[PDB]
């Protein structure tokens, strides 16, 4: 028995209440099943984990150097190419985060830089989005190339702008056209234009990787992910089965920027917004900051386990902000069943994470901003199983530990040194997002006033 069935996230909400948690659609020329609520998402991605970890093919990635051992991680098919890069990135992130604690130090320094760029606005109103973008990009640059960029660096601005444009290309009529029917990529006028900006983004990274190649000291342990990768590539010369090759290096690095920039930055943008709309919550986080850390010392990760309210608030920013509502598509390898219905092999799965984060049977007030969603009456932090902003299963976000570190360190450092407020004489910003692959706060401005 197949599932029933006839911007986007609201239409899927209505379709849920019509046909239920597991329903069918036939978009482009593609069979889709949408999954709603914890139980269907969990059943598909965990219980049937082994047969839902594949990605729908994407013909136009042909343009970006994709091949059987050059698929990067994000859109790579389930198989050894995916699995080798997934293990590499996971363990590289673990290693860089242990011993010397390099990632934590890079994030701590970027938070200091980010506070200074906030101070220099001197209590005049401003949109914080651009600065959040830069801070979070520098964390990726640190992870992947072992450097940061000055916030006024022109190359950095260029890399950022190209990245923003190349996210737009991910959601295009054009893009879906050649993707859905790929034989029109023989026409050079079409092919050259779909991923114009992504190619330029990739060209700018190539330039950075070339520089990094020159300064790499292979006589020392790798100090960042690209070095670790380059070391593996050397061991793999003469092995055509390896995914450690120059064509894949640039896709892996570009996947890490693509997946880890706008998500983390947009989440922080939600957090500041929710802090000026809910100044009472802001002050109570500032209370816990002062009482656990002080107004002087830089926040460290070891603080987080003693700050259940700030942890609650950050979790609630993620749940309410709901920045990846329809997740990232999967594809079924074998046939499976979910909530009774049968799902044939080759079906594109859409995981409706928003329906998990906003399930009315799980959360007390799913459409309000409410830190007590993660607090018990004693004030202990609790994390409900429906907290899945990173999805679940084999393909669940590999950057989650770095994002948790970034959200806590950037968010607490900022509220440690500033008070945020709607600027006098402007409308209360809306708390409704704008969907465009990611859900972002409506554009808003704020005042950052130092606290000492
Ligand atoms: C709040 C911040 C973030 C959120 C909400 C987020 C969310 C997600 C989601 C929903 C997925 C889809 C998982 C699926 O296929 O079901 C994903 C995958 C992924 N994310 Fe994140 N992400 C965040 C930050 C990051 C960071 C900082 C990095 C890199 C350092 C990163 C790298 C990746 C990669 C490489 C994948 C694909 C994993 C795979 O296909 O094996 N993300 N993320
Ligand atoms: C600024 S280019 C950009 C920005 C944000 C995202 C993505 C691309 N990608 C694909 C990553 C791509 C990067 C170029 C090399 C090949 N790989 C696969 C993506 C795909 C599907 C859902 C979400 C996302 S997040
Ligand atoms: C890749 S990660 C990701 C995460 C959420 C969505 C999408 C992709 N897609 C692809 C759905 C796809 C199914 C097969 C036929 C063509 N259609 C678009 C999408 C694209 C544009 C608007 C909304 C959405 S929902
Ligand atoms: Zn390096
Ligand atoms: Zn308790
Ligand atoms: Zn200060």
Coordinates of C-alpha atoms and ligand atoms in Angstrom, one line a residue:
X1 CA 0.0 0.0 0.0
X2 CA 1.4 3.3 -1.2
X3 CA 1.0 6.6 0.7
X4 CA -2.0 8.9 -0.2
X5 CA -1.8 12.3 -1.9
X6 CA -3.2 14.7 -4.5
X7 CA 6.0 29.3 0.1
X8 CA 6.6 25.5 0.4
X9 CA 6.6 24.7 4.1
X10 CA 3.1 26.0 4.7
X11 CA 1.7 23.9 1.8
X12 CA 3.2 20.8 3.2
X13 CA 1.6 21.6 6.6
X14 CA -1.8 21.7 4.9
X15 CA -1.1 18.5 3.0
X16 CA -0.1 16.8 6.3
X17 CA -3.5 17.6 7.9
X18 CA -5.3 16.4 4.8
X19 CA -3.6 13.0 4.1
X20 CA -1.5 12.4 7.3
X21 CA 2.1 11.9 8.3
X22 CA 3.3 10.0 5.2
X23 CA 2.1 11.2 1.9
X24 CA 3.0 11.1 -1.8
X25 CA 3.7 13.7 -4.6
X26 CA 5.1 13.5 -8.1
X27 CA 7.2 16.6 -8.7
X28 CA 9.0 17.3 -11.9
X29 CA 9.2 13.7 -13.1
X30 CA 10.3 12.5 -9.6
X31 CA 8.3 10.4 -7.1
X32 CA 8.4 12.0 -3.7
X33 CA 7.2 10.9 -0.2
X34 CA 7.1 13.5 2.5
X35 CA 7.7 12.4 6.1
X36 CA 6.1 14.2 9.0
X37 CA 6.5 13.9 12.8
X38 CA 9.2 12.2 14.9
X39 CA 7.9 8.6 14.5
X40 CA 7.9 8.6 10.6
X41 CA 11.1 10.6 10.4
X42 CA 12.7 8.2 13.0
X43 CA 11.3 5.1 11.4
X44 CA 12.7 6.1 8.0
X45 CA 16.1 7.5 8.9
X46 CA 17.0 5.3 11.9
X47 CA 15.1 1.9 11.9
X48 CA 15.5 1.8 8.1
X49 CA 18.7 3.8 8.3
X50 CA 20.6 1.5 5.9
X51 CA 18.1 2.0 3.0
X52 CA 17.5 5.7 3.4
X53 CA 21.1 7.1 3.6
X54 CA 21.4 7.7 -0.2
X55 CA 21.0 11.0 -2.0
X56 CA 18.9 11.7 -5.1
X57 CA 21.2 12.0 -8.2
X58 CA 21.8 15.6 -9.3
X59 CA 22.9 15.7 -13.0
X60 CA 24.2 19.3 -13.0
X61 CA 26.9 18.6 -10.4
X62 CA 28.6 17.1 -13.5
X63 CA 29.5 20.7 -14.1
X64 CA 31.5 20.9 -10.8
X65 CA 34.0 18.0 -11.2
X66 CA 31.8 15.3 -9.7
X67 CA 32.8 11.8 -10.5
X68 CA 32.6 8.3 -8.9
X69 CA 35.5 9.1 -6.5
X70 CA 34.9 12.9 -6.4
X71 CA 31.5 13.4 -4.8
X72 CA 32.5 15.3 -1.7
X73 CA 30.3 14.4 1.3
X74 CA 27.1 16.5 1.2
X75 CA 25.5 15.2 -2.1
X76 CA 27.6 12.1 -2.4
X77 CA 25.8 8.8 -3.0
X78 CA 25.6 6.2 -0.3
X79 CA 28.7 4.1 -0.8
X80 CA 32.5 4.1 -0.2
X81 CA 33.1 7.5 -1.7
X82 CA 30.6 9.0 0.8
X83 CA 31.7 6.8 3.6
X84 CA 35.4 7.5 3.3
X85 CA 34.9 11.3 3.3
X86 CA 32.3 11.1 6.0
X87 CA 34.7 9.2 8.4
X88 CA 37.6 11.5 7.5
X89 CA 35.6 14.7 8.2
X90 CA 34.1 13.4 11.4
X91 CA 37.4 12.3 12.8
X92 CA 39.3 15.4 11.6
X93 CA 36.7 17.5 13.5
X94 CA 37.1 15.3 16.5
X95 CA 40.9 15.5 16.4
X96 CA 41.1 19.3 15.8
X97 CA 38.7 19.5 18.8
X98 CA 40.9 17.4 21.2
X99 CA 44.3 17.8 22.7
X100 CA 45.3 21.4 22.0
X101 CA 41.6 22.2 21.4
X102 CA 42.3 24.2 18.2
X103 CA 38.7 24.6 17.0
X104 CA 37.6 26.0 20.4
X105 CA 40.5 28.5 20.3
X106 CA 39.7 29.5 16.7
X107 CA 36.1 30.1 17.7
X108 CA 37.0 31.9 20.9
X109 CA 39.3 34.3 18.9
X110 CA 36.6 34.9 16.3
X111 CA 34.1 35.7 19.0
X112 CA 36.5 38.3 20.4
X113 CA 36.8 39.8 16.9
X114 CA 33.1 39.7 16.5
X115 CA 32.5 41.6 19.7
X116 CA 35.0 44.3 18.5
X117 CA 33.2 44.7 15.2
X118 CA 30.0 45.1 17.3
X119 CA 31.6 47.8 19.5
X120 CA 32.8 49.8 16.5
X121 CA 29.2 50.4 15.5
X122 CA 28.9 52.6 18.6
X123 CA 25.3 52.1 19.5
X124 CA 24.0 53.3 16.1
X125 CA 21.5 50.8 14.6
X126 CA 22.7 48.2 12.1
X127 CA 21.8 44.8 10.5
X128 CA 24.0 42.2 12.2
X129 CA 23.7 39.6 9.4
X130 CA 26.9 40.5 7.5
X131 CA 29.1 40.4 10.5
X132 CA 27.6 37.1 11.6
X133 CA 28.3 35.7 8.1
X134 CA 31.9 36.7 8.4
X135 CA 32.6 35.4 11.9
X136 CA 31.1 32.0 11.0
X137 CA 33.0 31.9 7.6
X138 CA 36.2 32.5 9.4
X139 CA 35.5 29.5 11.6
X140 CA 35.2 27.4 8.4
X141 CA 38.3 29.0 7.0
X142 CA 40.1 28.1 10.2
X143 CA 38.8 24.5 10.2
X144 CA 39.7 24.0 6.5
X145 CA 42.7 26.2 5.8
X146 CA 44.1 27.2 9.3
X147 CA 43.7 30.9 8.8
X148 CA 41.1 33.7 9.2
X149 CA 40.4 36.8 7.1
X150 CA 40.1 40.4 8.2
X151 CA 36.5 41.5 8.0
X152 CA 37.4 44.1 5.4
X153 CA 39.6 41.8 3.3
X154 CA 38.5 42.2 -0.3
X155 CA 39.0 38.5 -1.3
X156 CA 37.0 37.5 1.8
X157 CA 34.2 39.9 0.8
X158 CA 34.4 38.3 -2.7
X159 CA 34.3 34.7 -1.4
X160 CA 31.3 35.7 0.7
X161 CA 29.3 37.4 -2.0
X162 CA 29.9 34.6 -4.4
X163 CA 28.7 32.2 -1.7
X164 CA 25.5 34.1 -1.2
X165 CA 24.8 34.2 -4.9
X166 CA 25.6 30.5 -5.3
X167 CA 23.1 29.6 -2.6
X168 CA 20.5 31.4 -4.7
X169 CA 21.4 29.2 -7.7
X170 CA 20.5 26.2 -5.6
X171 CA 16.9 27.3 -5.7
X172 CA 16.2 28.2 -9.3
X173 CA 13.6 27.6 -12.0
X174 CA 16.6 27.2 -14.4
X175 CA 18.5 25.0 -12.0
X176 CA 15.6 22.6 -11.6
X177 CA 15.0 22.6 -15.4
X178 CA 18.4 21.3 -16.6
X179 CA 18.5 19.2 -13.5
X180 CA 15.1 17.6 -14.1
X181 CA 16.0 17.1 -17.8
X182 CA 19.8 17.0 -18.1
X183 CA 20.3 16.7 -21.9
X184 CA 19.9 20.5 -22.3
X185 CA 23.4 20.8 -20.9
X186 CA 24.7 20.3 -24.4
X187 CA 23.6 23.9 -25.1
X188 CA 26.5 26.0 -23.9
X189 CA 24.4 29.1 -23.3
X190 CA 22.3 27.2 -20.7
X191 CA 25.1 25.1 -19.1
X192 CA 27.3 28.0 -18.5
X193 CA 24.7 29.9 -16.6
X194 CA 23.0 27.5 -14.1
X195 CA 25.9 27.5 -11.6
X196 CA 27.7 30.6 -12.8
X197 CA 28.4 31.8 -9.3
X198 CA 29.2 28.4 -7.7
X199 CA 31.9 28.0 -10.3
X200 CA 33.3 31.4 -9.4
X201 CA 33.1 30.4 -5.7
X202 CA 35.0 27.3 -6.5
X203 CA 37.6 29.2 -8.5
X204 CA 38.2 31.5 -5.6
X205 CA 38.7 28.5 -3.2
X206 CA 41.1 26.9 -5.7
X207 CA 43.2 30.1 -5.3
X208 CA 43.1 29.8 -1.5
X209 CA 43.9 26.1 -1.6
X210 CA 46.9 26.8 -3.9
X211 CA 48.2 29.3 -1.4
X212 CA 47.7 26.9 1.4
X213 CA 49.5 24.2 -0.5
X214 CA 52.6 26.5 -0.6
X215 CA 52.6 27.1 3.2
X216 CA 51.8 23.5 4.3
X217 CA 54.6 21.9 6.4
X218 CA 54.2 18.1 5.9
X219 CA 56.9 17.5 8.5
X220 CA 54.5 18.6 11.2
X221 CA 51.2 17.1 12.2
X222 CA 48.3 18.6 10.1
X223 CA 47.0 21.7 11.7
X224 CA 43.7 21.8 9.7
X225 CA 41.5 19.7 7.6
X226 CA 43.0 20.5 4.3
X227 CA 46.4 19.4 5.6
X228 CA 45.0 16.2 6.9
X229 CA 43.5 15.6 3.5
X230 CA 46.7 16.4 1.6
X231 CA 48.6 13.9 3.8
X232 CA 46.0 11.2 2.9
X233 CA 46.3 12.1 -0.8
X234 CA 50.0 11.5 -0.6
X235 CA 49.5 8.1 0.9
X236 CA 46.9 7.4 -1.8
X237 CA 49.1 8.0 -4.9
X238 CA 48.6 5.1 -7.2
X239 CA 45.3 4.0 -5.6
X240 CA 42.5 4.7 -8.0
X241 CA 39.9 3.6 -5.4
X242 CA 40.8 6.5 -3.0
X243 CA 38.5 9.5 -2.7
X244 CA 41.5 11.6 -1.6
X245 CA 42.4 13.4 -4.8
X246 CA 42.6 17.0 -6.0
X247 CA 39.2 17.0 -7.6
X248 CA 37.5 15.9 -4.4
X249 CA 39.5 18.2 -2.1
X250 CA 37.8 21.3 -3.5
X251 CA 34.4 19.7 -3.4
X252 CA 34.8 18.6 0.3
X253 CA 36.0 22.1 1.3
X254 CA 33.2 23.8 -0.6
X255 CA 30.7 21.5 1.0
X256 CA 31.9 22.5 4.5
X257 CA 31.5 26.2 3.6
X258 CA 28.2 25.6 1.9
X259 CA 26.7 23.5 4.7
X260 CA 28.2 25.3 7.6
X261 CA 28.1 29.1 6.9
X262 CA 24.5 30.3 6.3
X263 CA 23.1 27.7 8.7
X264 CA 25.1 28.8 11.7
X265 CA 25.0 32.5 10.8
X266 CA 21.2 32.5 10.2
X267 CA 20.7 30.7 13.5
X268 CA 22.7 33.4 15.3
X269 CA 20.7 36.0 13.5
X270 CA 17.5 34.4 14.9
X271 CA 19.1 34.4 18.3
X272 CA 19.8 38.2 18.4
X273 CA 16.3 38.9 17.0
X274 CA 14.7 36.7 19.7
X275 CA 16.8 38.5 22.3
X276 CA 15.5 42.0 21.4
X277 CA 11.9 40.7 21.0
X278 CA 12.2 39.0 24.4
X279 CA 14.5 41.2 26.5
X280 CA 13.4 39.5 29.7
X281 CA 15.0 36.3 28.4
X282 CA 18.1 38.3 27.4
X283 CA 18.5 39.6 30.9
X284 CA 18.1 36.2 32.5
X285 CA 20.8 34.8 30.2
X286 CA 23.0 37.8 31.2
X287 CA 22.3 37.0 34.8
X288 CA 23.5 33.4 34.4
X289 CA 26.5 34.6 32.4
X290 CA 27.5 37.0 35.2
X291 CA 27.0 34.4 37.9
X292 CA 28.8 31.5 36.2
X293 CA 31.5 33.3 34.1
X294 CA 31.7 37.0 35.0
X295 CA 31.8 40.1 32.8
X296 CA 35.6 39.8 32.1
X297 CA 36.7 36.2 31.2
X298 CA 36.0 34.7 27.7
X299 CA 33.3 32.0 27.7
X300 CA 34.7 28.4 27.4
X301 CA 32.9 25.2 26.4
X302 CA 33.3 23.9 29.9
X303 CA 30.9 26.6 31.1
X304 CA 28.0 25.3 29.0
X305 CA 27.3 22.3 31.4
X306 CA 26.8 24.9 34.2
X307 CA 24.5 27.2 32.2
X308 CA 21.2 25.2 31.7
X309 CA 19.2 28.4 31.0
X310 CA 21.5 29.7 28.3
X311 CA 21.6 26.2 26.9
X312 CA 17.8 26.0 27.0
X313 CA 17.6 29.4 25.2
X314 CA 20.0 28.4 22.4
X315 CA 18.1 25.1 21.9
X316 CA 14.9 27.1 21.7
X317 CA 16.4 29.5 19.2
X318 CA 17.1 26.5 17.0
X319 CA 13.7 24.9 17.4
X320 CA 11.7 28.1 17.0
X321 CA 14.0 29.5 14.3
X322 CA 13.5 26.2 12.4
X323 CA 16.0 27.2 9.7
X324 CA 16.0 23.9 7.7
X325 CA 12.3 23.1 7.7
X326 CA 12.3 20.4 5.0
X327 CA 15.8 19.1 5.7
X328 CA 17.9 17.8 2.9
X329 CA 16.4 15.1 0.5
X330 CA 17.3 11.5 0.8
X331 CA 16.6 8.5 -1.5
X332 CA 15.6 5.0 -0.7
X333 CA 18.0 2.2 -1.6
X334 CA 15.7 -0.8 -1.0
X335 CA 12.0 -0.9 -0.6
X336 CA 10.8 -0.2 3.0
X337 CA 7.7 0.6 5.0
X338 CA 7.0 3.6 7.1
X339 CA 3.9 3.9 9.3
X340 CA 2.4 1.0 7.4
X341 CA 2.7 2.5 3.9
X342 CA 5.1 1.0 1.4
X343 CA 7.9 3.1 -0.1
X344 CA 9.5 1.7 -3.3
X345 CA 13.2 1.9 -4.0
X346 CA 14.3 5.1 -5.8
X347 CA 11.8 7.3 -3.9
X348 CA 13.0 10.8 -3.0
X349 CA 12.3 11.2 0.8
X350 CA 11.6 14.7 2.2
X351 CA 12.0 14.9 6.0
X352 CA 9.8 17.6 7.4
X353 CA 12.0 18.6 10.3
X354 CA 9.7 21.6 11.0
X355 CA 6.9 19.1 11.8
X356 CA 9.2 17.5 14.4
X357 CA 10.4 20.8 15.9
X358 CA 6.8 22.2 16.0
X359 CA 4.8 19.1 16.7
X360 CA 1.8 20.1 18.9
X361 CA 1.7 16.8 20.7
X362 CA 5.3 17.1 21.9
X363 CA 6.0 20.8 22.7
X364 CA 3.9 22.8 25.1
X365 CA 3.6 25.9 22.9
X366 CA 5.3 25.0 19.6
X367 CA 4.6 28.4 17.9
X368 CA 5.9 30.6 20.7
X369 CA 9.4 31.3 21.8
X370 CA 9.7 29.5 25.1
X371 CA 13.0 28.4 26.6
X372 CA 11.1 26.2 29.1
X373 CA 10.7 23.8 26.2
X374 CA 14.2 22.6 27.3
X375 CA 13.9 23.3 31.1
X376 CA 12.2 21.2 33.8
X377 CA 10.6 22.9 36.9
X378 CA 13.9 22.7 38.7
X379 CA 15.7 24.5 35.9
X380 CA 17.6 21.4 34.7
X381 CA 18.2 21.4 31.0
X382 CA 16.3 18.7 29.2
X383 CA 16.5 17.8 25.5
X384 CA 13.4 16.2 24.1
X385 CA 13.8 13.5 21.4
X386 CA 12.0 15.7 19.0
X387 CA 14.9 18.2 19.0
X388 CA 16.2 17.2 15.5
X389 CA 17.4 20.4 13.8
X390 CA 20.3 18.3 12.5
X391 CA 18.1 15.4 11.2
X392 CA 19.0 11.8 12.3
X393 CA 20.6 8.7 11.0
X394 CA 23.7 8.0 9.0
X395 CA 23.5 11.3 7.1
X396 CA 22.7 13.6 10.1
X397 CA 24.7 16.8 10.1
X398 CA 28.4 16.0 10.6
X399 CA 29.1 19.6 11.7
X400 CA 26.8 19.4 14.7
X401 CA 29.6 19.4 17.4
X402 CA 31.2 22.5 15.7
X403 CA 27.8 24.3 15.4
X404 CA 27.0 23.6 19.0
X405 CA 30.4 25.1 19.9
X406 CA 29.9 28.1 17.6
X407 CA 26.3 28.9 18.8
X408 CA 27.2 28.7 22.5
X409 CA 30.5 30.6 22.3
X410 CA 29.3 33.4 19.9
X411 CA 25.9 33.8 21.5
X412 CA 27.2 34.0 25.1
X413 CA 30.2 36.2 24.2
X414 CA 27.9 38.6 22.5
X415 CA 25.3 38.8 25.3
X416 CA 28.2 39.0 27.8
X417 CA 29.4 42.3 26.4
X418 CA 26.2 43.9 25.0
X419 CA 22.6 44.6 25.6
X420 CA 20.5 44.3 22.5
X421 CA 17.3 46.2 21.8
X422 CA 14.9 47.2 19.0
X423 CA 16.1 50.7 18.0
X424 CA 13.9 53.6 19.1
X425 CA 11.3 54.6 16.6
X426 CA 11.2 51.5 14.5
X427 CA 8.5 48.8 14.3
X428 CA 8.8 45.7 16.4
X429 CA 10.5 43.2 14.0
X430 CA 8.4 40.3 12.8
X431 CA 9.1 36.8 14.2
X432 CA 8.0 35.2 10.9
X433 CA 10.7 33.8 8.7
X434 CA 11.2 34.0 4.9
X435 CA 11.7 30.7 3.2
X436 CA 14.5 30.3 0.6
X437 CA 16.0 26.8 1.2
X438 CA 16.9 28.2 4.6
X439 CA 14.4 30.1 6.7
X440 CA 15.8 33.5 7.8
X441 CA 14.4 36.2 10.1
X442 CA 12.7 39.1 8.3
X443 CA 15.4 41.8 7.8
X444 CA 15.7 43.8 11.0
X445 CA 18.2 46.2 12.8
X446 CA 19.3 46.4 16.4
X447 CA 21.3 48.4 18.9
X448 CA 24.3 46.9 20.6
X449 CA 25.0 48.8 23.8
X450 CA 28.1 47.7 25.9
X451 CA 27.4 46.5 29.4
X452 CA 30.5 48.1 31.0
Ligands
LIG1 C1 22.9 25.4 13.2 C2 23.8 25.0 12.3 C3 23.5 23.8 11.3 C4 22.4 23.2 11.0 C5 20.9 23.5 11.5 C6 22.7 22.1 10.1 C7 21.7 21.2 9.6 C8 22.0 20.2 8.7 C9 21.0 19.3 8.2 C10 19.4 19.4 8.4 C11 21.6 18.4 7.4 C12 20.9 17.3 6.6 C13 21.1 15.9 7.2 C14 20.3 14.9 6.3 O1 20.7 14.5 5.2 O2 19.2 14.4 6.8 C15 23.0 18.7 7.5 C16 24.0 18.0 6.8 C17 25.4 18.4 6.7 N1 26.0 19.4 7.4 FE1 25.0 20.6 8.8 N2 24.0 22.1 9.9 C18 24.6 23.1 10.6 C19 26.0 23.4 10.6 C20 27.0 22.7 9.9 C21 28.4 22.9 10.0 C22 29.0 24.0 11.0 C23 29.0 22.1 9.2 C24 30.6 22.0 8.8 C25 31.6 22.3 9.7 C26 28.0 21.3 8.5 C27 28.2 20.4 7.5 C28 27.3 19.5 7.0 C29 27.5 18.4 6.1 C30 28.9 18.1 5.4 C31 26.4 17.8 5.9 C32 26.0 16.5 5.0 C33 26.3 15.3 5.8 C34 26.1 14.0 4.9 O3 25.4 14.1 3.9 O4 26.8 13.0 5.2 N3 26.8 21.7 9.0 N4 23.2 19.8 8.3
LIG2 C1 27.6 28.6 -2.4 S1 27.3 27.0 -3.2 C2 26.1 26.3 -2.1 C3 25.6 26.9 -1.0 C4 24.9 26.3 0.0 C5 24.6 24.9 -0.2 C6 25.1 24.2 -1.3 C7 25.8 24.9 -2.3 N1 24.7 22.9 -1.5 C8 25.6 22.0 -2.3 C9 27.1 22.0 -1.9 C10 27.9 22.1 -3.2 C11 28.9 23.3 -3.1 C12 29.7 23.4 -4.4 C13 30.4 22.2 -4.8 C14 29.4 21.0 -4.8 N2 28.7 20.9 -3.6 C15 27.8 19.7 -3.6 C16 23.5 22.4 -1.1 C17 22.8 21.4 -1.8 C18 21.5 21.0 -1.4 C19 20.9 21.6 -0.3 C20 21.6 22.5 0.5 C21 22.9 22.9 0.1 S2 23.8 24.0 1.1
LIG3 C1 18.6 19.0 -2.0 S1 18.3 19.4 -0.3 C2 16.7 20.0 -0.3 C3 15.9 20.4 0.8 C4 14.6 20.8 0.7 C5 14.0 20.8 -0.6 C6 14.8 20.5 -1.7 C7 16.1 20.0 -1.5 N1 14.2 20.6 -2.9 C8 14.1 19.5 -3.9 C9 12.8 18.9 -4.0 C10 12.8 18.3 -5.4 C11 12.2 16.9 -5.5 C12 12.5 16.3 -6.9 C13 12.0 17.2 -8.0 C14 12.5 18.6 -7.8 N2 12.1 19.1 -6.5 C15 12.3 20.5 -6.4 C16 13.5 21.8 -3.2 C17 13.8 22.6 -4.3 C18 13.1 23.8 -4.4 C19 12.2 24.3 -3.4 C20 11.9 23.5 -2.4 C21 12.6 22.2 -2.2 S2 12.3 21.3 -0.8
LIG4 ZN1 47.2 24.7 7.1
LIG5 ZN1 15.3 18.0 37.0
LIG6 ZN1 33.0 44.1 27.4

